[PDB]
Amino acid sequence: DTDRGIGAQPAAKLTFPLSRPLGVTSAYFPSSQGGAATSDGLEMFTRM
Amino acid sequence: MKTVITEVIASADSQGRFLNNTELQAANGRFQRATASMEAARALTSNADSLVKGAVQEVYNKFPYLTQPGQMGYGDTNQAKCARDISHYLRFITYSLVAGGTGPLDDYIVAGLREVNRTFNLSPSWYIEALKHIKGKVGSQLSGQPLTEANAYIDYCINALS
Amino acid sequence: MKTVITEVIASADSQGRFLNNTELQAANGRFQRATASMEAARALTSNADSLVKGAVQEVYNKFPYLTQPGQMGYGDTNQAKCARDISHYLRFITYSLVAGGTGPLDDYIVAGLREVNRTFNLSPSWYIEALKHIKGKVGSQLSGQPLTEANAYIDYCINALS
Amino acid sequence: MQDAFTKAIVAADLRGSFLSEQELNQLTNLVKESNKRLDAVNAITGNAAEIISDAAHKLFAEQTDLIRPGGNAYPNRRMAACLRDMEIILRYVSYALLAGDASVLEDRCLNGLKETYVALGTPTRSVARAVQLMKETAIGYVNSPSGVTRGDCSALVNEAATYFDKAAASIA
Amino acid sequence: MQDAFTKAIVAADLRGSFLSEQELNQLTNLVKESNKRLDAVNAITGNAAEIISDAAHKLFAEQTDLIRPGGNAYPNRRMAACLRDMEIILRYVSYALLAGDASVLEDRCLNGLKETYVALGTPTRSVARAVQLMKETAIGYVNSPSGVTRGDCSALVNEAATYFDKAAASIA
Amino acid sequence: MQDAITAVINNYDVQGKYLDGAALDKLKAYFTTGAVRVRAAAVISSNATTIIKEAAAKALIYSDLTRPGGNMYTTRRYAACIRDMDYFLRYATYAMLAGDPSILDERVLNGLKETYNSLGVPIAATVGGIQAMKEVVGGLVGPDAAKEASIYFDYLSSGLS
Amino acid sequence: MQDAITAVINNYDVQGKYLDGAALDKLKAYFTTGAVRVRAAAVISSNATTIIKEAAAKALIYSDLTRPGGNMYTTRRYAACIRDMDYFLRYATYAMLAGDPSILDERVLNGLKETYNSLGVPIAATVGGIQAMKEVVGGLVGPDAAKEASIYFDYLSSGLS
Amino acid sequence: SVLTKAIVNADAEARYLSPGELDRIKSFVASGERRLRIAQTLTEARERIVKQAGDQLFQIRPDVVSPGGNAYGEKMTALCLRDLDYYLRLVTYGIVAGDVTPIEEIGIIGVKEMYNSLQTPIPAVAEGVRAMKNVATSLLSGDDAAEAGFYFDYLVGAMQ
Amino acid sequence: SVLTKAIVNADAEARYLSPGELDRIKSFVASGERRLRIAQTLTEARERIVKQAGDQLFQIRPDVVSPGGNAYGEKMTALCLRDLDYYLRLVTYGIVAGDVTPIEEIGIIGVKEMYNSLQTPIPAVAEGVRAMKNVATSLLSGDDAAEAGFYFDYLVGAMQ
Amino acid sequence: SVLTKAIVNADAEARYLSPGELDRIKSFVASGERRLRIAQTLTEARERIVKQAGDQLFQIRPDVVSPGGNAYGEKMTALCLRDLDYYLRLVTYGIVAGDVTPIEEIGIIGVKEMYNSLQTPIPAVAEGVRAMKNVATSLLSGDDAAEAGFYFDYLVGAMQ
Ligand SMILES: CCC1=C(C)/C(=C/C2=NC(=C\c3[nH]c(/C=C4\NC(=O)[C@H](C)[C@H]4CC)c(C)c3CCC(=O)O)/C(CCC(=O)O)=C2C)NC1=O
Ligand SMILES: CCC1=C(C)/C(=C/C2=NC(=C\c3[nH]c(/C=C4\NC(=O)[C@H](C)[C@H]4CC)c(C)c3CCC(=O)O)/C(CCC(=O)O)=C2C)NC1=O
């Protein structure tokens, strides 16, 4: 981290990085695929 | 913005643990207290208009000379900016009442107060006297724990200005 | 020692600040909550004897092999030190109930737990199973907010051991 | 940091006016449901370890590549990092749930997280999945707890889900 | 740090015992009087500046040597330090009052304080007096306030005095 | 067509009445929800295509409907079906802005049941396509607007069955 | 037919769901108004004939309808018309007890519009006969029941128009 | 309304509402309470407003109320004020709708043909409306009086 | 419901409800909150109730779960408990309706033909229902347990 | 503009502007200074906005910038951000006009045909615009950010 090349030293790097607003991906429908996932009423019962 | 919930959440984050009982117990307080707070808030909200005009005038009645020419309580713009400023204070008092902490007051009025007032030649004494008056009248709009809440925050501003 | 009261005071002190409405609201939570907490405390206190013998046994019933010769649930001294240890846990649970926070648990059982258990060849699983059992029986000694409190702290110990 | 009230206040201030009886009663309702909220946050805290553990067991059941050499949850050091991240995210989701606002989750935890993982070579889709599993189990606990008064917690279960879903979306 | 409950717990533990029914009810009473306690702490917070100011005006009214050259509250720098110490002590007294125990006051404020002042040349007897004046005024405010249901708030005060008196004794 | 406001005006006009307190209360009940309707429309419009795609994916395709013998078999008919879907979404957005279902009757439902019977278009399958778009919409628009958007999708679907 | 309660049961049965909190709240909202529905039915039933007579007097007779060329000319047709009126009153009383309009569709409205077109029976005049009986009913049953009785008369009348 | 007008243009071009169209709905709805107050004040003074328009009219045109005048006589004058009451009502409707759709279908489309048949002098009906503007406008604040005035001048415009 | 049953008899005889019919609607609706509580308790313990009915069943008839038994195997047993879950659900519906209309159309009319096809032994399904009565009834107060019990015994009756 | 749109509808129906049309011109012009401020802020940060949109885009679609991607390479990426600069400019125009007339003739009518020829994936251009909304919106007050946001969502809408 040194200034010898110009002498002045660089402009702050993080100002634009610091600013980023949170990405907006709204709505969004989830996914079950993936593999086929059980559905049915039997799931509890088999377990019981 | 400093509030009950925010503070406890921050504590948890710093400790990097989990919302345990201590935290939950503390938070309940803020929830249990909301009713009194929010009653104070509604009363201060609807009386705002007159609370502001009452306090503005009282600044001139206590500092008569302010309203003479060449002074800072003279002309439409000074007197306009005054009403506005007391209105800002009452606004943040209601916010602090609703929020469950001093955060809104700390962030929007206390942080920087003296530097601003000093550059603009605004005496805290006026503002204390505006608030002392608002405190007098709020004695008969509220009672019980809503009054205690209103008082807590008015006094907080008076102490902040001092 | 972590309680709602000590936490808010710590937070004020560290900002060089008087207690304000945020911090007093928090304290009210801890005080409002004392009744349920202290009912749990009294019930856990008088049933201590049997809660301890119940959980001790359950450690042997769930880990049958512990009670065979050459093992750590055999002989008067192991079985004695076990009862004592569960009794320590219940004791600090009652303290945490009465104190309004996890402090007593954090300072006297959690700080150092794993190092000690690891040097002495004590499996957390036993202790979790002691506590799971204590949790089962406390279901019928208490109900409502006293049960929730008892649960909060029992579960807190189980998470400390996982 | 924001909570649901603080959020209201910031929006009001940007108008330069007081509460719009609209916003007041929305917040009165949050106070109305706050005991349920405390139970919901308590459900997560009281089962944090199992929620992480159970999510974990299942993540590696599905994705047996992560625990092979070459995989991002191998050797012990990496598995401990992965278990630690599961805890960190579950933590900030519980904070958001006490607060009634996602901001603490987005600002301290989710902001930059995806780009961290990509820099590291950590497979974000696997991390997203681990978050989906934590959600399933966490909500399980919110819905079926120890001697809590019987009522309807679906509003809170939804809101908790959106915090889990925010995190997943942000990371994948 | 201790509060009145924590103190009970430490003494119980040193016996190896669950809290005595004796100690339980002493603490039940503290919960009984806790609304009054909150008002008492609030009385101090709400008038902190005036309590310090009024104590101050009166301290220098009595001891006009402190504000002469050669005096320990001269020039502005030293007066600001003295005003600051008045605030610090009033602050830890209010903390003790919320806690129901003097320990935070003794451990964070009073411990070493006398020897600090002697090293500095700060006249401890004057500092003790400034504390006595803060006590008078602090105890003053709580008694009459606006609209607080009528009852006996009397029992609450003494304890605040002992915290002021601890500080005075410790310093003089 | 009519909206909330003209519904009231025409109901009073036929009686030749100036607007009275009851009328004025109704109109307020509309105006007070107005800003929220606008925000919701901007979400639906700008996510239009994604809503149709997620609604088709949950309720229409990967099925016998898209296979030979099915009504949305052929690129022609698949195109006609998602074209229809866009109509429904778009008009429901109009109804919700207006706060009145009358446009859904005048410009969408009138004769549509029999039109679908005449072409063979499966009614029950179309309703599921409507109630899937509602599901997606209710997520995207949020607490503020969810119930209000939803009703005009429900108006559409009981209009066919 | 269905009532409030079976409306909910069948809506859940098709999803195979046990009744949940939302369902239980709906059923409560019915049970809590139940006693008032019963009292209102006993007033209507016992004033049946007077309601028809006052409704006809305000909205049908003393007119071209009862004169030669009119549809309720002849004792035959006058009898058929007030017979109809009794149906409406009686069924609306069923709908209001059930807290569900489904019976008004199944046993009264289905095909009735076209039946009236085929015989020449004046629709607009019949609606006025319905809305006049509502007016009378709302006086007789009182604050408790007025709004609840009224809606099923309004259901009937927008079912014809 | 503003809503109906915006939507009809949207549907006719097979599209969602424009930013512009959305903006005007927003500005319109913000003026809701104010527009409702303007209608209330005028509804509250309707009988007075008719009477003062009617005096202003008969001074300016004593002939309409003269032997060969359309409004000559006590009951030819009674119907004339009733028509003035009709148009004030429609003006209150227009103000709360934020456009003329309702005002137009109810009382201007066909109005030439109606009044030509009755042989009513149309331009003196336009005067009766100006007269109502003058009275109504004196019961409203400057800002509300202008907002009301646009709808009065519209009716005056349409009878032309 | 009680409502549906009363009304259908009313309409079929072309008449208003009887004093009797009105009385039962009144007594029924008064028991609303109680009936809702009975359904809640049982809904809240559904998984337990099926598990204990299922144990009681397989002790009494280990054969059904035997080589030549309709419910022999893990997934032939899973479907069997699912059917027991179905009938408990219908029993909660019946209790809140105050009669069987719903229970009947959903799960007894056609049940002989369904199970004969599947070759399910009907009388052992009736036993599974008795087993559920026993469990459910142990989670209800005496008075509520009887009220529930009528609906269990109905299903047991209809499979006959 | 709002003016052009109002007038064109007026002239096409051979008439003077409606009260409604006049009202929206008035509300629009009152927002003039505010709309000009919104355009200034965004004009002032154009280089930053285009870039943060461009980062958000390439994370979400690293493929467009991949072997078989329309924007693959340094100068196929340079033109892509230039197109993002074009659309931000048009968005500032739209905001000051209060409708899309200008935005539409300049950059949506014909855009399908243009990009289909170039084989540019249209829906990822729509994403680049959402990305710009996110950045631009973080440099504006809540109220101004919404007003701006309508015009961003329009462009996103038209590429569809
Ligand atoms: C968000 C919270 C907030 C506060 C509290 C606030 C105070 C504040 N008061 C100001 C000015 C002012 N304040 C006053 C106050 C008064 N004049 C009188 O007639 C009375 C004596 C008195 C009222 C009691 C006056 C006269 C000015 C104009 C000062 C100047 O520019 O010369 C200014 C300078 C900027 C401006 O001219 O508006 C600030 C920032 N600003 C804020 O943003
Ligand atoms: C203040 C809180 C506190 C805790 C919790 C505590 C735990 C604790 N348990 C210990 C030993 C022990 N703990 C047990 C525990 C058990 N044996 C059994 O039969 C069961 C399997 C099980 C009970 C569930 C045994 C057998 C020892 C003796 C270990 C040894 O010295 O070999 C020791 C070592 C010192 C000693 O031998 O006493 C500590 C410090 N000490 C504390 O000060």
Ligand SMILES: CCC1=C(C)/C(=C/C2=NC(=C\c3[nH]c(/C=C4\NC(=O)[C@H](C)[C@H]4CC)c(C)c3CCC(=O)O)/C(CCC(=O)O)=C2C)NC1=O
């Ligand atoms: C120590 C911090 C703290 C907690 C945790 C707390 C919990 C708490 N939960 C309560 C109620 C409740 N809590 C629930 C929660 C649930 N119901 C369900 O069926 C779900 C399984 C679960 C969803 C989260 C319900 C339904 C009620 C009763 C309704 C209500 O009071 O809102 C009540 C009111 C008293 C009662 O009815 O028991 C308290 C005090 N109070 C506190 O001060």
Ligand SMILES: CCC1=C(C)/C(=C/C2=NC(=C\c3[nH]c(/C=C4\NC(=O)[C@H](C)[C@H]4CC)c(C)c3CCC(=O)O)/C(CCC(=O)O)=C2C)NC1=O
């Ligand atoms: C833990 C909380 C805490 C306390 C209590 C505290 C006391 C304290 N007071 C100090 C100085 C001081 N304190 C005073 C106070 C007084 N002068 C008088 O004449 C009066 C009798 C009295 C006011 C009532 C003065 C004048 C000094 C400056 C001495 C000097 O630098 O000459 C200093 C030296 C550092 C400094 O000047 O900032 C400490 C550490 N510091 C702490 O951190």
Ligand SMILES: CCC1=C(C)/C(=C/C2=NC(=C\c3[nH]c(/C=C4\NC(=O)[C@H](C)[C@H]4CC)c(C)c3CCC(=O)O)/C(CCC(=O)O)=C2C)NC1=O
């Ligand atoms: C925001 C934190 C917080 C505060 C401050 C709080 C105060 C508080 N003080 C109370 C009572 C009271 N407070 C006092 C206090 C006094 N009486 C006197 O005459 C003295 C001047 C003063 C001595 C300190 C008394 C006497 C009562 C009534 C008795 C009691 O409830 O204990 C009560 C019970 C309700 C009532 O009777 O008004 C509350 C809630 N509660 C809170 O949650």
Ligand SMILES: CCC1=C(C)/C(=C/C2=NC(=C\c3[nH]c(/C=C4\NC(=O)[C@H](C)[C@H]4CC)c(C)c3CCC(=O)O)/C(CCC(=O)O)=C2C)NC1=O
């Ligand atoms: C006989 C007339 C006819 C055709 C052609 C037809 C195509 C068709 N392609 C589909 C999906 C698909 N088609 C493809 C095809 C491709 N992906 C690529 O990148 C390549 C460019 C291309 C392979 C060469 C893919 C990847 C999907 C899955 C898209 C999705 O699920 O979102 C689907 C939806 C899935 C389904 O329900 O079947 C249909 C209906 N349907 C018809 O009725």
Ligand SMILES: CCC1=C(C)/C(=C/C2=NC(=C\c3[nH]c(/C=C4\NC(=O)[C@H](C)[C@H]4CC)c(C)c3CCC(=O)O)/C(CCC(=O)O)=C2C)NC1=O
């Ligand atoms: C051509 C076939 C035919 C007949 C006969 C007929 C009769 C008829 N008689 C009427 C009334 C009436 N009719 C009578 C007649 C009598 N009052 C008495 O006490 C005497 C017994 C009797 C005179 C001999 C009276 C008093 C009314 C008025 C009843 C009322 O308004 O309630 C009305 C209702 C009034 C109306 O709208 O016209 C009709 C329709 N309508 C028909 O279409």
